[PDB]
Amino acid sequence: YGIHEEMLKDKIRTESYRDFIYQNPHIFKDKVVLDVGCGTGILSMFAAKAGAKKVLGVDQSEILYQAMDIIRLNKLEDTITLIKGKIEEVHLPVEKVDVIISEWMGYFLLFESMLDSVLYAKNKYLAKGGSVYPDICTISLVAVSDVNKHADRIAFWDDVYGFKMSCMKKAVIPEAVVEVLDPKTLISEPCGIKHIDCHTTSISDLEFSSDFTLKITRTSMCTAIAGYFDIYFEKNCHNRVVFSTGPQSTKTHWKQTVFLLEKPFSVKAGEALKGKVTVHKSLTVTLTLNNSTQTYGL
Amino acid sequence: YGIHEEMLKDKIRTESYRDFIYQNPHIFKDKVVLDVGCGTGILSMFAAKAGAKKVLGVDQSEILYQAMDIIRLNKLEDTITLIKGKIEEVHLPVEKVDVIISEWMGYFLLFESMLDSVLYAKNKYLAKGGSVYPDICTISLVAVSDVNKHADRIAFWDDVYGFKMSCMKKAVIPEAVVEVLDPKTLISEPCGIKHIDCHTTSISDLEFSSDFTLKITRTSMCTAIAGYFDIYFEKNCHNRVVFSTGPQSTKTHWKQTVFLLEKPFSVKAGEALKGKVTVHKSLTVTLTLNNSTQTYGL
Numbered sequence: 001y002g003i004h005e006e007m008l009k010d011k012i013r014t015e016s017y018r019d020f021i022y023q024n025p026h027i028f029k030d031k032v033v034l035d036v037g038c039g040t041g042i043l044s045m046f047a048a049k050a051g052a053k054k055v056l057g058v059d060q061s062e063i064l065y066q067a068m069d070i071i072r073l074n075k076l077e078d079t080i081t082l083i084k085g086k087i088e089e090v091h092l093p094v095e096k097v098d099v100i101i102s103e104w105m106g107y108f109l110l111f112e113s114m115l116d117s118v119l120y121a122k123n124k125y126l127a128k129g130g131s132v133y134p135d136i137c138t139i140s141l142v143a144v145s146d147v148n149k150h151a152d153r154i155a156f157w158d159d160v161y162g163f164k165m166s167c168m169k170k171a172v173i174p175e176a177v178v179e180v181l182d183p184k185t186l187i188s189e190p191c192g193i194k195h196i197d198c199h200t201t202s203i204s205d206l207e208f209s210s211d212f213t214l215k216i217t218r219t220s221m222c223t224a225i226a227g228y229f230d231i232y233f234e235k236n237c238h239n240r241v242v243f244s245t246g247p248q249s250t251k252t253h254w255k256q257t258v259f260l261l262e263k264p265f266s267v268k269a270g271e272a273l274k275g276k277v278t279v280h281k282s283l284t285v286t287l288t289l290n291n292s293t294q295t296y297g298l
Numbered sequence: 299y300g301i302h303e304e305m306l307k308d309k310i311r312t313e314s315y316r317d318f319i320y321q322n323p324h325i326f327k328d329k330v331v332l333d334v335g336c337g338t339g340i341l342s343m344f345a346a347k348a349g350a351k352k353v354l355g356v357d358q359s360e361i362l363y364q365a366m367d368i369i370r371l372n373k374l375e376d377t378i379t380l381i382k383g384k385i386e387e388v389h390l391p392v393e394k395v396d397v398i399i400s401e402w403m404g405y406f407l408l409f410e411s412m413l414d415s416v417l418y419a420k421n422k423y424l425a426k427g428g429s430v431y432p433d434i435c436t437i438s439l440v441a442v443s444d445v446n447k448h449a450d451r452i453a454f455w456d457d458v459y460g461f462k463m464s465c466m467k468k469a470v471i472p473e474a475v476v477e478v479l480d481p482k483t484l485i486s487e488p489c490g491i492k493h494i495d496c497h498t499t500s501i502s503d504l505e506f507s508s509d510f511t512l513k514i515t516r517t518s519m520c521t522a523i524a525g526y527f528d529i530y531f532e533k534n535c536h537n538r539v540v541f542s543t544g545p546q547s548t549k550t551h552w553k554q555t556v557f558l559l560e561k562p563f564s565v566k567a568g569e570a571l572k573g574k575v576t577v578h579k580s581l582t583v584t585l586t587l588n589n590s591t592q593t594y595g596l
């Protein structure tokens with residue numbers, strides 16, 4: 001229940017979806033809409049208000065029972081039908097749908113995300129000429145300098161209340177951190193490492209490699225690499241909607257994902273820093289930079 | 299691994315144990331010490347430095363493997379022996395111990411606490427005339443007024459992006475919240491509801507009822523009841539050690555536990571507010587106040 005309240009209070013997330021739906025009613029007017037992982041059913045109710053003919057909300061979680069009561073309190077049961085279960089298992093009362101909407105995104109976009117479900121739903125249920133929203137996603141990396149925070153996580157273990165705990169460093173390094181970053185600590189321009197169009201993407205496309213270049217903007221000690229993602233509502237929209245989960249933008253519940261570097265190294269403003277990143281499916285992230293390679297998990 | 303780092307950075311917690319051990323070396327000098335749920339082994343190393351003859355550190359968790367390396371880095375393996383497993387299952391290389399030390403405390407003292415293990419260890423392994431530390435614990439309640447935070451959790455659901463979500467209130471109310479309270483929001487003197495001496499306490503004593511009286515100190519709307527605990531190191535100490543996890547004291551990782559009231563009600567400064575609390579074994583907490591009864595869990 002906690003997460004749903006948090007997600008609803010995430011204004012950037014929820015109002016982006018609201019605006020997309022309300023400002024593009026033509027996408028919904030008299031349409032059949034599927035809401036994959038509907039939670040409390042908020043997106044389905046948006047879709048109904050924007051003039052959807054039928055809305056099907058699917059979720060495996062016990063939140064669905066609350067969704068049912070919520071739909072009744074708003075007198076929408078004649079438009080919105082809720083079904084408990086995994087999208088891959090449930091039986092729908094229609095063969096095809098016109099529009100798929102979902103808030104599926106995880107930390108670093110892909111960690112524990114529902115994208116597999118959305119893609120499954122797209123392939124089985126989306127009608128010819130149909131649409132999936134949000135339709136476009138990108139992932140970006142950005143270099144960080146924060147010697148003090150690095151010291152708090154790493155050098156910290158050298159002397160703990162007068163005792164050596166150095167071996168613990170090996171255990172902190174592989175754990176990606178979900179946290180809001182001070183944007184002043186960013187020492188490079190961002191670099192996109194992934195672009196996903198939900199209309200063309202397959203499940204195999206979610207495991208990917210990318211070479212990247214970080215355009216350094218401040219001479220400093222690089223201590224970590226941060227990742228985040230942008231969400232776009234584009235196809236057939238008169239009013240496009242974008243939101244970023246990056247540190248230069250208002251915080252969201254996704255915050256940013258931080259991959260700590262074991263051995264910080266100096267960089268110079270104007271320098272082009274090259275590395276390589278690979279994502280495998282929980283998810284892991286393999287980072288090569290400055291001739292070090294580390295695999296991270298969440 | 300995260301929790302252990304957090305616990306080590308909890309200065310109030312860790313330095314209280316450090317001071318108790320270092321400032322009362324007579325309790326440890328040439329003694330056999332058992333450390334129940336030893337984690338990284340920090341308390342065992344304190345005990346060794348204070349002059350323990352042998353220290354046995356027990357933990358079921360994979361952190362024990364790190365503890366082993368930590369003990370070696372500090373060259374303490376001739377004094378400290380670590381054993382993986384539950385205290386109720388493992389075989390010890392001694393029949394009896396002189397001193398038991400443990401950091402076992404949970405949120406609201408008893409939520410997911412290791413006290414059962416400590417009591418088991420006391421009964422099976424503590425020698426006649428031996429000691430357990432910390433030896434004394436208390437739990438306290440205190441009344442809270444925070445109409446704004448109450449509105450953020452409850453009235454919030456009346457209108458969510460133009461839709462009714464009132465039914466969700468029933469789901470938020472029973473969930474106790476772990477959070478640091480602004481001490482200005484406290485509207486009563488604290489009232490102790492439980493006193494535990496680890497030398498005399500049994501497992502059945504941890505399920506308890508208490509009538510309480512809250513001495514109201516500010517005329518206001520009571521919106522929640524908060525709970526916390528105090529830890530005492532007393533038996534045979536020349537230098538006693540106390541720490542509180544209450545909101546009038548420096549925050550600890552235990553923060554405070556907050557039980558929201560569904561129907562806030564007004565109180566007057568000087569008023570003696572009577573209620574009843576009962577704890578059952580996860581743990582639940584049943585609260586009667588102002589002729590309402592609610593059971594809470596974590």
Ligand SMILES: O=C(NCC(=O)c1ccccc1)Nc1ccc2nnsc2c1
Nearest residue numbers: 144146149150153177223224300303304
């Ligand atoms: O590592 C964290 N946060 C996690 C943290 O403080 C923590 C504390 C106790 C237990 C586990 C994690 N943040 C962070 C942010 C930016 C950074 N830049 N260079 S290193 C670094 C670390």
Ligand SMILES: O=C(NCC(=O)c1ccccc1)Nc1ccc2nnsc2c1
Nearest residue numbers: 002005006442444447448451475521522
């Ligand atoms: O309820 C919370 N905190 C939990 C919270 O803000 C939250 C936010 C999103 C999801 C789950 C919990 N705190 C709190 C503190 C003091 C109070 N006094 N009267 S009501 C009250 C609530």
